[PDB]
Amino acid sequence: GSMGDTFIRHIALLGFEKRFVPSQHYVYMFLVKWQDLSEKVVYRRFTEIYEFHKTLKEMFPIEAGAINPENRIIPHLPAPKWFDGQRAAENRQGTLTEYCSTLMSLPTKISRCPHLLDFFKVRPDDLKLP
């Protein structure tokens, strides 16, 4: 075999972004730092981060059961539309803010390794847009 997927150094978030398609929703401009591929840029959305996380919990119920109570610091909470106002703002601005720090922390380094890599190397908005 040979290397052809590799691994991650870390994540650094840049800020905002404007994705008016394929539906109306602003998104966040994220910087992924690879230890081989070097600097790489990717665009990320709310429902996508939720779908990721949800998929982790679906495929891995342990990562959402054995890692849920003991590690009761995983970013949960609904989407920013239940309290449409400053508490909708501070939902996404806290949930993402925590998921970046937490996706980095998770002890699921065996479960989440290919997931994170597939969070970034797949990015259907960076180079696999609608």
Short mmCIF file of N, CA, C and O in Angstrom, two decimals:
data_model
loop_
_atom_site.label_atom_id
_atom_site.label_comp_id
_atom_site.label_asym_id
_atom_site.label_seq_id
_atom_site.Cartn_x
_atom_site.Cartn_y
_atom_site.Cartn_z
N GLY A 1 0.84 -1.21 0.00
CA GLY A 1 0.00 0.00 0.00
C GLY A 1 0.87 1.25 0.00
O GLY A 1 2.09 1.15 0.05
N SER A 2 0.24 2.43 -0.05
CA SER A 2 0.91 3.72 -0.06
C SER A 2 -0.04 4.78 0.49
O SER A 2 -1.24 4.53 0.60
N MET A 3 0.48 5.96 0.83
CA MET A 3 -0.32 7.06 1.36
C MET A 3 -1.17 7.65 0.22
O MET A 3 -0.66 7.85 -0.88
N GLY A 4 -2.46 7.92 0.46
CA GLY A 4 -3.36 8.49 -0.53
C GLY A 4 -4.68 8.85 0.13
O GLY A 4 -5.75 8.51 -0.37
N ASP A 5 -4.56 9.53 1.26
CA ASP A 5 -5.65 10.02 2.08
C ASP A 5 -5.04 10.90 3.17
O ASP A 5 -5.55 11.99 3.45
N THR A 6 -3.92 10.43 3.75
CA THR A 6 -3.10 11.04 4.78
C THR A 6 -3.92 11.48 5.97
O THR A 6 -4.96 10.88 6.23
N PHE A 7 -3.40 12.46 6.73
CA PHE A 7 -3.94 12.88 8.01
C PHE A 7 -3.98 14.39 8.20
O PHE A 7 -3.52 15.12 7.32
N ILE A 8 -4.56 14.86 9.30
CA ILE A 8 -4.76 16.28 9.57
C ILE A 8 -3.79 16.86 10.60
O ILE A 8 -3.38 16.14 11.52
N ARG A 9 -3.46 18.16 10.48
CA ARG A 9 -2.64 18.85 11.46
C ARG A 9 -3.65 19.40 12.47
O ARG A 9 -3.62 19.00 13.63
N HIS A 10 -4.53 20.30 12.01
CA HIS A 10 -5.59 20.91 12.80
C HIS A 10 -6.49 21.80 11.94
O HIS A 10 -6.28 21.93 10.73
N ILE A 11 -7.49 22.42 12.60
CA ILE A 11 -8.46 23.32 12.01
C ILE A 11 -8.28 24.73 12.58
O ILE A 11 -7.92 24.88 13.74
N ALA A 12 -8.58 25.76 11.77
CA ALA A 12 -8.52 27.16 12.15
C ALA A 12 -9.69 27.76 11.39
O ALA A 12 -9.78 27.54 10.18
N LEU A 13 -10.61 28.48 12.04
CA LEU A 13 -11.76 29.04 11.34
C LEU A 13 -11.42 30.47 10.95
O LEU A 13 -10.69 31.14 11.68
N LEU A 14 -11.91 30.93 9.80
CA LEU A 14 -11.63 32.28 9.32
C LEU A 14 -12.79 33.18 9.64
O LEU A 14 -12.61 34.25 10.22
N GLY A 15 -13.99 32.73 9.28
CA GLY A 15 -15.16 33.54 9.59
C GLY A 15 -16.43 33.19 8.83
O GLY A 15 -16.91 32.06 8.90
N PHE A 16 -16.99 34.19 8.14
CA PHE A 16 -18.25 34.11 7.43
C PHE A 16 -18.06 33.63 5.99
O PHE A 16 -16.94 33.34 5.59
N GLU A 17 -19.16 33.58 5.23
CA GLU A 17 -19.29 33.24 3.82
C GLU A 17 -20.77 33.41 3.41
O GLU A 17 -21.65 33.39 4.26
N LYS A 18 -21.03 33.61 2.11
CA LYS A 18 -22.30 33.86 1.46
C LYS A 18 -22.59 32.78 0.41
O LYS A 18 -22.06 32.81 -0.70
N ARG A 19 -23.46 31.82 0.75
CA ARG A 19 -23.93 30.77 -0.13
C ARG A 19 -25.43 30.99 -0.27
O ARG A 19 -26.20 30.69 0.63
N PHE A 20 -25.86 31.54 -1.41
CA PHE A 20 -27.23 31.87 -1.67
C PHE A 20 -27.97 30.69 -2.30
O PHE A 20 -29.17 30.76 -2.51
N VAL A 21 -27.22 29.64 -2.64
CA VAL A 21 -27.66 28.45 -3.33
C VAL A 21 -27.09 27.20 -2.63
O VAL A 21 -26.10 27.31 -1.91
N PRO A 22 -27.70 26.01 -2.81
CA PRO A 22 -28.87 25.75 -3.62
C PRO A 22 -30.16 26.16 -2.88
O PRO A 22 -31.26 25.96 -3.38
N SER A 23 -30.00 26.76 -1.69
CA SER A 23 -31.03 27.28 -0.81
C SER A 23 -30.43 28.50 -0.12
O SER A 23 -29.21 28.71 -0.17
N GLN A 24 -31.27 29.34 0.51
CA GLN A 24 -30.83 30.56 1.15
C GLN A 24 -30.22 30.31 2.53
O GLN A 24 -30.94 29.93 3.45
N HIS A 25 -28.91 30.51 2.71
CA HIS A 25 -28.30 30.30 4.00
C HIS A 25 -26.84 30.80 4.04
O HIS A 25 -26.03 30.31 3.26
N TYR A 26 -26.44 31.73 4.93
CA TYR A 26 -25.02 32.07 4.96
C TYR A 26 -24.24 30.90 5.57
O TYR A 26 -24.82 30.08 6.28
N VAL A 27 -22.95 30.80 5.25
CA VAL A 27 -22.10 29.70 5.69
C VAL A 27 -20.79 30.25 6.25
O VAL A 27 -20.59 31.46 6.19
N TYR A 28 -19.90 29.41 6.82
CA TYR A 28 -18.65 29.82 7.40
C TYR A 28 -17.41 29.41 6.60
O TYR A 28 -17.27 28.23 6.25
N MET A 29 -16.51 30.37 6.35
CA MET A 29 -15.26 30.12 5.64
C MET A 29 -14.24 29.50 6.63
O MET A 29 -13.79 30.20 7.55
N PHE A 30 -13.89 28.22 6.45
CA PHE A 30 -12.98 27.47 7.31
C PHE A 30 -11.61 27.18 6.69
O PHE A 30 -11.54 26.82 5.52
N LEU A 31 -10.52 27.26 7.49
CA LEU A 31 -9.19 26.92 7.05
C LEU A 31 -8.77 25.55 7.59
O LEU A 31 -8.69 25.39 8.81
N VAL A 32 -8.49 24.58 6.70
CA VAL A 32 -8.01 23.28 7.13
C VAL A 32 -6.50 23.29 6.89
O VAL A 32 -6.05 23.71 5.81
N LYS A 33 -5.73 22.85 7.88
CA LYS A 33 -4.28 22.82 7.78
C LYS A 33 -3.84 21.37 7.71
O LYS A 33 -3.96 20.66 8.72
N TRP A 34 -3.34 20.91 6.55
CA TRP A 34 -2.90 19.54 6.46
C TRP A 34 -1.40 19.51 6.75
O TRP A 34 -0.71 20.48 6.46
N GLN A 35 -0.90 18.41 7.33
CA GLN A 35 0.54 18.31 7.64
C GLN A 35 1.35 17.86 6.42
O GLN A 35 2.57 17.80 6.50
N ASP A 36 0.68 17.55 5.30
CA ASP A 36 1.25 17.09 4.05
C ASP A 36 0.77 18.00 2.92
O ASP A 36 1.56 18.70 2.29
N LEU A 37 -0.55 18.02 2.68
CA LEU A 37 -1.16 18.85 1.66
C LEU A 37 -1.00 20.35 1.96
O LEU A 37 -1.29 21.16 1.08
N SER A 38 -0.56 20.74 3.17
CA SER A 38 -0.38 22.13 3.56
C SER A 38 -1.74 22.82 3.68
O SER A 38 -2.76 22.18 3.93
N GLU A 39 -1.74 24.15 3.52
CA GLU A 39 -2.92 24.98 3.62
C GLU A 39 -3.97 24.58 2.58
O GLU A 39 -3.64 24.41 1.40
N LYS A 40 -5.24 24.45 2.99
CA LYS A 40 -6.34 24.12 2.10
C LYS A 40 -7.56 24.84 2.67
O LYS A 40 -7.69 24.95 3.89
N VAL A 41 -8.43 25.38 1.81
CA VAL A 41 -9.57 26.17 2.24
C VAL A 41 -10.86 25.40 1.97
O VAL A 41 -10.92 24.70 0.97
N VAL A 42 -11.87 25.52 2.84
CA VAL A 42 -13.14 24.82 2.65
C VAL A 42 -14.28 25.66 3.22
O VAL A 42 -14.08 26.45 4.14
N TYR A 43 -15.48 25.49 2.67
CA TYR A 43 -16.67 26.23 3.00
C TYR A 43 -17.60 25.28 3.75
O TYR A 43 -17.78 24.17 3.27
N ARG A 44 -18.16 25.68 4.89
CA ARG A 44 -19.01 24.78 5.70
C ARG A 44 -20.33 25.43 6.13
O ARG A 44 -20.34 26.63 6.36
N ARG A 45 -21.42 24.64 6.25
CA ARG A 45 -22.76 25.11 6.63
C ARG A 45 -23.27 24.43 7.91
O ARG A 45 -22.76 23.40 8.32
N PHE A 46 -24.32 25.02 8.52
CA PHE A 46 -24.94 24.53 9.74
C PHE A 46 -25.54 23.13 9.61
O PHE A 46 -25.08 22.20 10.26
N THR A 47 -26.56 22.98 8.76
CA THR A 47 -27.23 21.69 8.54
C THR A 47 -26.26 20.60 8.10
O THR A 47 -26.54 19.42 8.31
N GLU A 48 -25.13 20.98 7.51
CA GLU A 48 -24.11 20.05 7.08
C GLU A 48 -23.34 19.58 8.32
O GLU A 48 -23.14 18.38 8.47
N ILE A 49 -22.93 20.50 9.19
CA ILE A 49 -22.21 20.13 10.40
C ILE A 49 -23.12 19.23 11.26
O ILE A 49 -22.65 18.25 11.84
N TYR A 50 -24.41 19.54 11.30
CA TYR A 50 -25.39 18.75 12.03
C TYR A 50 -25.51 17.39 11.38
O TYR A 50 -25.49 16.39 12.08
N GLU A 51 -25.62 17.34 10.05
CA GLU A 51 -25.72 16.07 9.35
C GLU A 51 -24.47 15.21 9.62
O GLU A 51 -24.59 14.01 9.85
N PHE A 52 -23.27 15.82 9.64
CA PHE A 52 -22.02 15.10 9.93
C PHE A 52 -22.15 14.44 11.28
O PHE A 52 -22.05 13.22 11.42
N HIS A 53 -22.34 15.29 12.28
CA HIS A 53 -22.42 14.88 13.66
C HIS A 53 -23.48 13.82 13.86
O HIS A 53 -23.26 12.83 14.55
N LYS A 54 -24.61 14.05 13.21
CA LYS A 54 -25.71 13.11 13.24
C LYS A 54 -25.28 11.77 12.65
O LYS A 54 -25.63 10.72 13.17
N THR A 55 -24.50 11.81 11.57
CA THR A 55 -24.03 10.60 10.91
C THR A 55 -23.07 9.88 11.81
O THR A 55 -23.13 8.66 11.91
N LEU A 56 -22.20 10.61 12.51
CA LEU A 56 -21.29 10.01 13.45
C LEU A 56 -22.13 9.25 14.46
O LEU A 56 -21.91 8.07 14.68
N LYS A 57 -23.11 9.93 15.06
CA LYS A 57 -23.95 9.27 16.04
C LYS A 57 -24.77 8.10 15.49
O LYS A 57 -25.10 7.18 16.25
N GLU A 58 -25.12 8.12 14.21
CA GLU A 58 -25.93 7.09 13.59
C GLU A 58 -25.07 5.87 13.33
O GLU A 58 -25.41 4.77 13.78
N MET A 59 -23.96 6.05 12.61
CA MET A 59 -23.07 4.95 12.31
C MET A 59 -22.48 4.40 13.61
O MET A 59 -22.51 3.19 13.84
N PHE A 60 -21.95 5.30 14.44
CA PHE A 60 -21.35 4.97 15.71
C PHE A 60 -22.35 5.28 16.85
O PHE A 60 -22.35 6.41 17.33
N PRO A 61 -23.22 4.36 17.34
CA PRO A 61 -24.13 4.72 18.43
C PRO A 61 -23.39 4.80 19.76
O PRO A 61 -23.86 5.43 20.70
N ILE A 62 -22.21 4.18 19.84
CA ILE A 62 -21.33 4.18 20.99
C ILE A 62 -20.77 5.58 21.16
O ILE A 62 -20.74 6.12 22.26
N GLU A 63 -20.36 6.19 20.05
CA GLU A 63 -19.85 7.54 20.07
C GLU A 63 -20.97 8.51 20.48
O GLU A 63 -20.70 9.69 20.71
N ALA A 64 -22.21 8.01 20.60
CA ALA A 64 -23.37 8.75 21.03
C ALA A 64 -24.11 8.01 22.14
O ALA A 64 -25.32 8.15 22.28
N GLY A 65 -23.37 7.22 22.92
CA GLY A 65 -23.95 6.45 23.99
C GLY A 65 -22.94 6.16 25.07
O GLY A 65 -23.19 6.48 26.23
N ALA A 66 -21.80 5.58 24.69
CA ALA A 66 -20.75 5.32 25.65
C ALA A 66 -19.90 6.56 25.81
O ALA A 66 -19.23 6.72 26.82
N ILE A 67 -19.93 7.43 24.79
CA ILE A 67 -19.17 8.67 24.78
C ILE A 67 -20.08 9.87 25.03
O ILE A 67 -19.64 11.00 25.00
N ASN A 68 -21.36 9.63 25.32
CA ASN A 68 -22.29 10.73 25.58
C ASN A 68 -22.34 11.18 27.04
O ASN A 68 -22.21 12.38 27.26
N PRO A 69 -22.54 10.32 28.04
CA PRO A 69 -22.61 10.76 29.43
C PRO A 69 -21.26 11.12 30.03
O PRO A 69 -21.12 12.17 30.65
N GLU A 70 -20.28 10.25 29.87
CA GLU A 70 -18.95 10.47 30.40
C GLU A 70 -18.33 11.70 29.75
O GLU A 70 -17.67 12.49 30.42
N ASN A 71 -18.60 11.86 28.45
CA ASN A 71 -18.11 12.96 27.64
C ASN A 71 -19.27 13.88 27.28
O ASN A 71 -19.36 14.34 26.15
N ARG A 72 -20.13 14.19 28.26
CA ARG A 72 -21.26 15.11 28.14
C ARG A 72 -20.83 16.58 27.94
O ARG A 72 -21.25 17.47 28.68
N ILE A 73 -20.00 16.84 26.93
CA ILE A 73 -19.48 18.14 26.53
C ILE A 73 -19.37 18.19 24.99
O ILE A 73 -18.62 18.99 24.45
N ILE A 74 -20.13 17.33 24.30
CA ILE A 74 -20.18 17.27 22.84
C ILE A 74 -21.23 18.31 22.43
O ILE A 74 -22.27 18.40 23.08
N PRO A 75 -20.99 19.13 21.38
CA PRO A 75 -21.91 20.18 20.99
C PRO A 75 -23.23 19.65 20.42
O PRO A 75 -23.29 19.26 19.25
N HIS A 76 -24.30 19.66 21.22
CA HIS A 76 -25.64 19.24 20.81
C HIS A 76 -26.43 20.53 20.51
O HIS A 76 -25.86 21.44 19.91
N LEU A 77 -27.71 20.64 20.90
CA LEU A 77 -28.58 21.80 20.68
C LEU A 77 -29.15 21.81 19.26
O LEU A 77 -28.48 21.37 18.33
N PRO A 78 -30.40 22.29 19.06
CA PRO A 78 -31.03 22.33 17.75
C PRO A 78 -30.46 23.45 16.88
O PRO A 78 -29.57 24.19 17.29
N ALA A 79 -30.99 23.56 15.65
CA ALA A 79 -30.60 24.56 14.67
C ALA A 79 -31.05 25.97 15.10
O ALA A 79 -32.00 26.10 15.87
N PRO A 80 -30.38 27.03 14.62
CA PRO A 80 -30.66 28.42 14.96
C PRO A 80 -31.95 28.98 14.34
O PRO A 80 -31.90 29.95 13.59
N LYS A 81 -33.10 28.39 14.66
CA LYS A 81 -34.40 28.85 14.16
C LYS A 81 -35.56 28.59 15.12
O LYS A 81 -36.72 28.75 14.74
N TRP A 82 -35.25 28.20 16.35
CA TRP A 82 -36.23 27.94 17.40
C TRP A 82 -36.40 29.21 18.23
O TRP A 82 -37.46 29.42 18.83
N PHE A 83 -35.36 30.05 18.27
CA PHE A 83 -35.33 31.29 19.02
C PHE A 83 -34.82 32.45 18.16
O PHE A 83 -34.13 33.32 18.69
N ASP A 84 -35.17 32.44 16.86
CA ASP A 84 -34.82 33.43 15.83
C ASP A 84 -34.64 34.85 16.39
O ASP A 84 -35.58 35.63 16.47
N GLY A 85 -33.41 35.17 16.80
CA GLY A 85 -33.00 36.43 17.38
C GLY A 85 -31.56 36.25 17.88
O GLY A 85 -30.82 35.41 17.35
N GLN A 86 -31.15 37.00 18.90
CA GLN A 86 -29.80 36.92 19.45
C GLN A 86 -29.46 35.54 20.02
O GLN A 86 -28.29 35.18 20.08
N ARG A 87 -30.47 34.75 20.38
CA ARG A 87 -30.25 33.41 20.93
C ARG A 87 -30.20 32.38 19.80
O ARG A 87 -29.83 31.24 20.04
N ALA A 88 -30.49 32.82 18.57
CA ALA A 88 -30.35 32.00 17.38
C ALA A 88 -28.93 32.24 16.87
O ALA A 88 -28.25 31.33 16.40
N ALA A 89 -28.47 33.49 17.02
CA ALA A 89 -27.14 33.92 16.65
C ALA A 89 -26.14 33.20 17.53
O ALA A 89 -25.26 32.49 17.04
N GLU A 90 -26.29 33.36 18.84
CA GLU A 90 -25.44 32.72 19.84
C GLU A 90 -25.60 31.20 19.90
O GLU A 90 -24.87 30.56 20.65
N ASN A 91 -26.50 30.60 19.11
CA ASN A 91 -26.64 29.15 19.08
C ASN A 91 -25.57 28.71 18.10
O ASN A 91 -24.66 27.99 18.48
N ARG A 92 -25.67 29.15 16.85
CA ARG A 92 -24.69 28.78 15.85
C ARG A 92 -23.29 29.30 16.18
O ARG A 92 -22.30 28.61 15.93
N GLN A 93 -23.22 30.51 16.75
CA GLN A 93 -21.94 31.13 17.10
C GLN A 93 -21.32 30.50 18.36
O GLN A 93 -20.20 30.87 18.71
N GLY A 94 -22.01 29.57 19.02
CA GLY A 94 -21.50 28.88 20.20
C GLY A 94 -21.29 27.41 19.85
O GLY A 94 -20.25 26.84 20.16
N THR A 95 -22.28 26.81 19.18
CA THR A 95 -22.28 25.42 18.74
C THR A 95 -21.14 25.18 17.77
O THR A 95 -20.46 24.18 17.91
N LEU A 96 -20.92 26.08 16.81
CA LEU A 96 -19.81 25.87 15.90
C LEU A 96 -18.52 26.12 16.65
O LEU A 96 -17.61 25.29 16.63
N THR A 97 -18.46 27.26 17.33
CA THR A 97 -17.33 27.69 18.15
C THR A 97 -16.87 26.58 19.08
O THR A 97 -15.67 26.45 19.33
N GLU A 98 -17.81 25.77 19.56
CA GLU A 98 -17.50 24.68 20.44
C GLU A 98 -17.20 23.46 19.60
O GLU A 98 -16.24 22.77 19.92
N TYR A 99 -17.94 23.19 18.52
CA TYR A 99 -17.60 22.03 17.73
C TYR A 99 -16.21 22.12 17.17
O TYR A 99 -15.55 21.11 17.14
N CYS A 100 -15.71 23.27 16.75
CA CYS A 100 -14.34 23.31 16.25
C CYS A 100 -13.38 22.87 17.35
O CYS A 100 -12.53 22.01 17.13
N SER A 101 -13.53 23.46 18.54
CA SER A 101 -12.68 23.10 19.67
C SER A 101 -12.87 21.65 20.14
O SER A 101 -11.93 21.05 20.67
N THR A 102 -14.07 21.11 19.98
CA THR A 102 -14.48 19.78 20.42
C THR A 102 -14.21 18.68 19.40
O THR A 102 -13.80 17.60 19.81
N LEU A 103 -14.35 18.93 18.10
CA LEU A 103 -14.04 17.99 17.02
C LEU A 103 -12.54 17.71 17.16
O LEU A 103 -12.07 16.62 16.85
N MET A 104 -11.78 18.70 17.66
CA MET A 104 -10.37 18.58 17.91
C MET A 104 -10.03 17.79 19.16
O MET A 104 -8.95 17.21 19.24
N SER A 105 -10.93 17.82 20.15
CA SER A 105 -10.73 17.22 21.46
C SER A 105 -11.18 15.77 21.52
O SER A 105 -10.49 14.98 22.15
N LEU A 106 -12.34 15.44 20.93
CA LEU A 106 -12.93 14.14 20.98
C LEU A 106 -11.98 12.94 21.13
O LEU A 106 -10.99 12.86 20.39
N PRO A 107 -12.28 12.01 22.06
CA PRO A 107 -11.43 10.85 22.28
C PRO A 107 -11.70 9.76 21.27
O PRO A 107 -11.09 8.69 21.30
N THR A 108 -12.60 10.05 20.34
CA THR A 108 -12.99 9.19 19.27
C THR A 108 -11.96 9.36 18.18
O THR A 108 -12.31 9.50 17.03
N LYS A 109 -10.67 9.40 18.51
CA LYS A 109 -9.70 9.62 17.46
C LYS A 109 -9.63 8.47 16.46
O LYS A 109 -9.13 8.66 15.35
N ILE A 110 -10.16 7.31 16.82
CA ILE A 110 -10.21 6.15 15.93
C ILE A 110 -11.51 6.18 15.12
O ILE A 110 -11.52 5.79 13.95
N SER A 111 -12.59 6.63 15.75
CA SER A 111 -13.92 6.70 15.15
C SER A 111 -14.04 7.90 14.21
O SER A 111 -14.55 7.80 13.09
N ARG A 112 -13.58 9.04 14.71
CA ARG A 112 -13.62 10.35 14.09
C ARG A 112 -12.49 10.66 13.14
O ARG A 112 -12.62 11.64 12.41
N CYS A 113 -11.39 9.90 13.12
CA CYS A 113 -10.30 10.22 12.19
C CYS A 113 -10.82 10.29 10.76
O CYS A 113 -10.84 11.38 10.17
N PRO A 114 -11.26 9.17 10.17
CA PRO A 114 -11.77 9.18 8.81
C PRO A 114 -12.98 10.08 8.66
O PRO A 114 -13.17 10.61 7.57
N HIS A 115 -13.76 10.29 9.72
CA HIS A 115 -14.90 11.18 9.64
C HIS A 115 -14.38 12.60 9.37
O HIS A 115 -14.75 13.20 8.35
N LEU A 116 -13.52 13.16 10.23
CA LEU A 116 -12.98 14.49 10.00
C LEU A 116 -12.35 14.60 8.61
O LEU A 116 -12.65 15.51 7.83
N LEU A 117 -11.48 13.66 8.29
CA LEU A 117 -10.86 13.63 6.97
C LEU A 117 -11.96 13.70 5.92
O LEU A 117 -11.86 14.49 5.00
N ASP A 118 -13.03 12.92 6.04
CA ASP A 118 -14.18 12.94 5.13
C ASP A 118 -15.10 14.17 5.30
O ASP A 118 -16.07 14.32 4.56
N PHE A 119 -14.81 15.05 6.26
CA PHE A 119 -15.54 16.27 6.59
C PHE A 119 -14.96 17.32 5.67
O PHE A 119 -15.68 18.19 5.17
N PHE A 120 -13.65 17.22 5.49
CA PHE A 120 -12.79 18.09 4.72
C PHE A 120 -12.47 17.64 3.29
O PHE A 120 -12.70 18.39 2.35
N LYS A 121 -11.90 16.45 3.13
CA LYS A 121 -11.50 15.94 1.82
C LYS A 121 -12.67 15.73 0.86
O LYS A 121 -12.46 15.57 -0.34
N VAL A 122 -13.90 15.73 1.38
CA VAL A 122 -15.11 15.56 0.60
C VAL A 122 -15.72 16.92 0.29
O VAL A 122 -16.02 17.15 -0.88
N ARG A 123 -15.89 17.80 1.29
CA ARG A 123 -16.44 19.15 1.10
C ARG A 123 -17.20 19.45 -0.20
O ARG A 123 -16.61 20.07 -1.10
N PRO A 124 -18.49 19.07 -0.31
CA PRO A 124 -19.30 19.35 -1.48
C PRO A 124 -19.79 20.81 -1.49
O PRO A 124 -20.99 21.10 -1.54
N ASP A 125 -18.81 21.70 -1.47
CA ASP A 125 -18.88 23.15 -1.55
C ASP A 125 -17.53 23.80 -1.82
O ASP A 125 -17.45 24.96 -2.22
N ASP A 126 -16.45 23.04 -1.63
CA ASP A 126 -15.10 23.47 -1.90
C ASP A 126 -14.78 23.10 -3.34
O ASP A 126 -14.37 23.96 -4.12
N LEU A 127 -14.94 21.82 -3.69
CA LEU A 127 -14.62 21.31 -5.01
C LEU A 127 -15.62 20.24 -5.44
O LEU A 127 -15.32 19.43 -6.32
N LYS A 128 -16.82 20.22 -4.83
CA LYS A 128 -17.86 19.26 -5.14
C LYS A 128 -19.22 19.93 -4.90
O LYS A 128 -20.17 19.32 -4.42
N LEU A 129 -19.26 21.22 -5.25
CA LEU A 129 -20.37 22.15 -5.18
C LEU A 129 -21.63 21.63 -5.89
O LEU A 129 -21.57 20.60 -6.56
N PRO A 130 -22.79 22.32 -5.77
CA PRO A 130 -24.03 21.88 -6.40
C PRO A 130 -23.97 22.09 -7.92
O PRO A 130 -24.76 21.40 -8.60
#
